[PDB]
Motif scaffolding. Structure first.
Motif, PDB file in Angstrom:
ATOM      1  N   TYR A  61       0.798  -1.062   0.014  1.00  0.00           N
ATOM      2  CA  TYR A  61      -0.072  -0.169   0.001  1.00  0.00           C
ATOM      3  C   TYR A  61       0.860   1.170  -0.131  1.00  0.00           C
ATOM      4  O   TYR A  61       0.674   2.268  -0.770  1.00  0.00           O
ATOM      5  CB  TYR A  61      -0.943  -0.013   1.206  1.00  0.00           C
ATOM      6  CG  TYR A  61      -1.728   1.192   1.331  1.00  0.00           C
ATOM      7  CD1 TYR A  61      -1.209   2.359   2.287  1.00  0.00           C
ATOM      8  CD2 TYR A  61      -3.029   1.377   0.658  1.00  0.00           C
ATOM      9  CE1 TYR A  61      -1.808   3.491   2.280  1.00  0.00           C
ATOM     10  CE2 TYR A  61      -3.534   2.475   0.819  1.00  0.00           C
ATOM     11  CZ  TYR A  61      -3.068   3.721   1.665  1.00  0.00           C
ATOM     12  OH  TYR A  61      -3.812   4.821   1.821  1.00  0.00           O
TER      13      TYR A  61
ATOM     14  N   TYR B 266      -8.667  -5.141   3.873  1.00  0.00           N
ATOM     15  CA  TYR B 266      -8.813  -4.390   2.622  1.00  0.00           C
ATOM     16  C   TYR B 266     -10.419  -4.631   2.199  1.00  0.00           C
ATOM     17  O   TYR B 266     -10.680  -5.801   2.476  1.00  0.00           O
ATOM     18  CB  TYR B 266      -7.934  -4.869   1.517  1.00  0.00           C
ATOM     19  CG  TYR B 266      -6.477  -4.483   1.345  1.00  0.00           C
ATOM     20  CD1 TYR B 266      -6.141  -3.390   1.092  1.00  0.00           C
ATOM     21  CD2 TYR B 266      -5.565  -5.462   1.791  1.00  0.00           C
ATOM     22  CE1 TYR B 266      -4.920  -2.832   0.849  1.00  0.00           C
ATOM     23  CE2 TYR B 266      -4.190  -4.985   1.696  1.00  0.00           C
ATOM     24  CZ  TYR B 266      -3.990  -3.863   1.257  1.00  0.00           C
ATOM     25  OH  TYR B 266      -2.675  -3.171   1.049  1.00  0.00           O
TER      26      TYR B 266
ATOM     27  N   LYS C 132       3.984   1.659  -0.901  1.00  0.00           N
ATOM     28  CA  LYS C 132       4.892   1.751  -2.153  1.00  0.00           C
ATOM     29  C   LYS C 132       3.987   2.166  -3.341  1.00  0.00           C
ATOM     30  O   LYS C 132       4.455   2.875  -4.037  1.00  0.00           O
ATOM     31  CB  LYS C 132       5.516   0.238  -2.436  1.00  0.00           C
ATOM     32  CG  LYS C 132       6.800  -0.046  -1.868  1.00  0.00           C
ATOM     33  CD  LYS C 132       7.140  -1.362  -1.531  1.00  0.00           C
ATOM     34  CE  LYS C 132       8.541  -1.979  -1.562  1.00  0.00           C
ATOM     35  NZ  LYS C 132       8.640  -2.777  -3.032  1.00  0.00           N
ATOM     36  N   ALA C 133       2.682   1.940  -3.016  1.00  0.00           N
ATOM     37  CA  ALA C 133       2.066   2.431  -4.071  1.00  0.00           C
ATOM     38  C   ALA C 133       1.133   3.868  -3.916  1.00  0.00           C
ATOM     39  O   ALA C 133       1.217   4.644  -4.635  1.00  0.00           O
ATOM     40  CB  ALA C 133       0.487   1.567  -4.224  1.00  0.00           C
ATOM     41  N   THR C 134       1.192   4.333  -2.794  1.00  0.00           N
ATOM     42  CA  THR C 134       0.319   5.622  -2.201  1.00  0.00           C
ATOM     43  C   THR C 134       1.455   6.643  -1.824  1.00  0.00           C
ATOM     44  O   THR C 134       1.110   7.900  -1.937  1.00  0.00           O
ATOM     45  CB  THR C 134      -0.527   5.427  -1.066  1.00  0.00           C
ATOM     46  OG1 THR C 134      -0.038   4.733  -0.111  1.00  0.00           O
ATOM     47  CG2 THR C 134      -1.700   4.447  -1.637  1.00  0.00           C
TER      48      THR C 134
ATOM     49  N   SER D 293      -4.207   7.231  -3.180  1.00  0.00           N
ATOM     50  CA  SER D 293      -4.196   6.450  -4.290  1.00  0.00           C
ATOM     51  C   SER D 293      -3.033   6.103  -4.915  1.00  0.00           C
ATOM     52  O   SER D 293      -2.222   6.794  -4.713  1.00  0.00           O
ATOM     53  CB  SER D 293      -5.276   6.825  -5.124  1.00  0.00           C
ATOM     54  OG  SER D 293      -4.895   8.084  -5.660  1.00  0.00           O
ATOM     55  N   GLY D 294      -2.777   5.022  -5.609  1.00  0.00           N
ATOM     56  CA  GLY D 294      -1.741   4.577  -6.275  1.00  0.00           C
ATOM     57  C   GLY D 294      -1.517   3.160  -6.866  1.00  0.00           C
ATOM     58  O   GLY D 294      -2.478   2.509  -6.323  1.00  0.00           O
ATOM     59  N   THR D 295      -0.740   2.812  -7.682  1.00  0.00           N
ATOM     60  CA  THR D 295      -0.287   1.356  -8.008  1.00  0.00           C
ATOM     61  C   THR D 295       0.775   0.970  -7.535  1.00  0.00           C
ATOM     62  O   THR D 295       1.729   1.859  -7.499  1.00  0.00           O
ATOM     63  CB  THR D 295      -0.657   1.280  -9.810  1.00  0.00           C
ATOM     64  OG1 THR D 295       0.573   2.096 -10.344  1.00  0.00           O
ATOM     65  CG2 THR D 295      -1.885   1.917 -10.233  1.00  0.00           C
ATOM     66  N   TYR D 296       0.939  -0.276  -7.279  1.00  0.00           N
ATOM     67  CA  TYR D 296       2.163  -0.933  -6.793  1.00  0.00           C
ATOM     68  C   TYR D 296       2.716  -2.031  -7.900  1.00  0.00           C
ATOM     69  O   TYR D 296       3.663  -1.792  -8.640  1.00  0.00           O
ATOM     70  CB  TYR D 296       1.997  -1.584  -5.466  1.00  0.00           C
ATOM     71  CG  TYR D 296       3.265  -2.473  -5.031  1.00  0.00           C
ATOM     72  CD1 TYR D 296       4.410  -2.094  -5.223  1.00  0.00           C
ATOM     73  CD2 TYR D 296       2.991  -3.775  -4.521  1.00  0.00           C
ATOM     74  CE1 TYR D 296       5.479  -2.839  -4.809  1.00  0.00           C
ATOM     75  CE2 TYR D 296       3.841  -4.511  -4.222  1.00  0.00           C
ATOM     76  CZ  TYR D 296       5.416  -3.975  -4.258  1.00  0.00           C
ATOM     77  OH  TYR D 296       6.324  -4.840  -3.785  1.00  0.00           O
TER      78      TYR D 296
ATOM     79  N   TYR E 184      -4.348   0.826  -5.133  1.00  0.00           N
ATOM     80  CA  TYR E 184      -4.459   0.873  -3.796  1.00  0.00           C
ATOM     81  C   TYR E 184      -4.827   2.175  -3.229  1.00  0.00           C
ATOM     82  O   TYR E 184      -4.207   3.029  -3.863  1.00  0.00           O
ATOM     83  CB  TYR E 184      -3.086   0.468  -2.894  1.00  0.00           C
ATOM     84  CG  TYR E 184      -2.593  -0.963  -3.496  1.00  0.00           C
ATOM     85  CD1 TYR E 184      -1.917  -1.337  -4.431  1.00  0.00           C
ATOM     86  CD2 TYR E 184      -2.632  -2.020  -2.158  1.00  0.00           C
ATOM     87  CE1 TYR E 184      -1.407  -2.419  -4.801  1.00  0.00           C
ATOM     88  CE2 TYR E 184      -1.932  -3.088  -2.468  1.00  0.00           C
ATOM     89  CZ  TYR E 184      -1.401  -3.480  -3.651  1.00  0.00           C
ATOM     90  OH  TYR E 184      -0.835  -4.619  -4.058  1.00  0.00           O
TER      91      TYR E 184
END
Lengths: 13, 182
Positions: free
Chosen positions: A6, B146, A8-10, B166-169, B174
Motif C-alpha cells: 500500500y 482491505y 509503495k503505491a500511495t 491512491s496509487g498502483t504498486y 491501492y
C-alpha cells in the motif's frame, strides 16, 4: 498498520 | 514551514457545554478538523492566543486529532476537563484544510512538519480500511485488511473524490477511502 504494498503505491519513494 | 504559525489557545465551555464555535471538516469530508465561524461573544477565553475562523484544529490537550472524524474529535474533547488547550493554525499559503492534498505534500525527513504529517496519517489509518484491486490473499479478512474491489469501482471512487490516498504498486490499485461519519 498499512502494508508495504500500500505504501509503495500511495507514498513517494 | 507548515507548522510555523501553530499557536495554543486555552478556552473553556460556555452555557450549553459548547465551544462558541462549531467543528467542521473531519476525515469523513476528507478534511482537517477546522473551526466554523468564531463569533466574539461566545468563546470563553482563558489564556494563550485568540481563535479566528477557519483555523485548522491540530491538538486537544496534547491529543492529536487531525486525521480523525469529527465524531472522534468531539470524543476527545468530552473526555477533557476544562480548560481545553487547543493547538491550531490559520489556513493560508500552504496551510489548507484539504487532507488529500496535505498528505501529498513532501517535507524534509526529520522536520516537525514531517513528524506531524506522519501523526496525521496514522490517525487517518486508525479510522479507515484501505481498498485494493489485487486479489484476496489467504489470511485476509475482507472489510478489515482491505475492501477488495474491481478496477472500475476504484476508478469510480477516484473520479468521485472518495479517495484520500491512491496509487498502483504491481499492476494493481491501492487507496484509502474517506471514513464514514458515524
Amino acid at each position: 498498520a498499512r502494508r508495504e504494498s500500500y505504501l509503495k503505491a500511495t507514498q513517494p519513494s | 514551514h507548515w507548522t510555523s504559525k501553530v499557536h495554543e489557545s486555552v478556552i473553556g465551555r460556555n452555557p450549553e457545554g459548547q465551544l462558541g464555535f462549531e467543528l467542521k471538516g473531519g476525515a469523513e469530508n476528507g478534511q482537517f478538523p477546522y473551526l466554523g465561524e468564531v463569533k466574539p461573544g461566545k468563546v470563553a477565553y482563558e489564556s494563550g492566543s485568540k481563535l479566528v475562523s477557519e483555523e485548522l484544529l491540530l491538538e486537544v490537550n496534547e491529543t492529536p486529532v487531525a486525521g480523525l472524524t469529527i465524531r472522534d474529535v468531539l470524543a476527545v474533547i468530552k473526555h477533557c476537563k476544562d480548560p481545553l488547550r487547543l493547538k491550531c493554525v490559520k489556513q493560508g499559503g500552504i496551510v489548507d484544510k484539504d487532507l488529500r492534498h496535505y498528505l501529498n505534500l513532501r517535507f524534509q525527513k526529520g522536520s516537525v512538519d514531517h513528524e506531524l504529517q506522519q501523526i496525521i496519517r496514522d490517525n487517518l489509518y486508525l479510522r479507515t480500511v484501505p481498498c485494493t484491486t489485487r486479489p484476496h490473499k489467504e489470511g485476509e479478512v475482507p472489510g478489515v485488511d482491505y475492501i477488495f474491489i474491481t478496477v472500475e469501482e476504484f476508478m469510480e471512487l477516484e473520479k468521485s473524490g472518495a479517495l484520500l490516498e491512491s496509487g498502483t504498486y504491481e499492476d494493481n490499485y491501492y487507496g484509502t477511502p474517506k471514513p464514514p461519519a458515524e
